[PDB]
């Protein structure tokens, strides 16, 4: 189970400059709240690097992997955490009047959201889905 | 903020029969764990109907609206709750050997997940995203 928040903001620079800035992963710690800094750095998909992630006051060492790299449209990475917590950061660049639109999607798992007990929540809803699929099979 | 769980199960009936079963919304209470029954019923997109939703032991009266209706592939509805809680049910039908694959995606908001205080969690992460977008604007 993953919970996502997606927010977009407009910036008066070219989609070129915006992409070149967000694609500068070394500078990610300058402005992305949840990235405190790296602990490992080449760039493209499959690149694996360890960083420190600050979410919800919990700080956790995460192994990030670039899952998508589409210049100059968008870059997306997912990461694994110590407690099996899952993270996702998806930055998109679109054109707009006056410049660009930068969209950040933040994805957190249950454990990264609430601790090792948000897994209780995740398990409950996953079991609801499992039971629904079964009852469907058993009735048709 | 919305948290999603998506699980797929295989059923030995034709994609025809599977779609006709999941599209029978009156029978949704037969097998979908979170749908306890309706309180209102025509069918297609924009159709608005009130039902009772059981998620996480919390029972809440939800105004569901069919947001997507694609025979015989998939049907998707989102719903509003008393506390401003948000719900989403997305049932997809694909073909496979031996019959069909039925996929259920369940989407719950923070309040429907944890009560009026999961909104604290949602607000925290939404504010992280807002701050990140701002700091980006202020630095480029």
UniProtKB/Swiss-Prot annotation, chains A, B:
InterPro entries in alphabetical order: Polyketide_cyclase/dehydratase (IPR019587), START-like_dom_sf (IPR023393)
Pfam families cross-referenced by the UniProt entry: Polyketide_cyc2
Signal peptide extent: none
GO annotations of cellular component type: plasma membrane
Classification via SUPFAM superfamilies: Bet v1-like
Protein name, entry field: Uncharacterized protein Rv1546
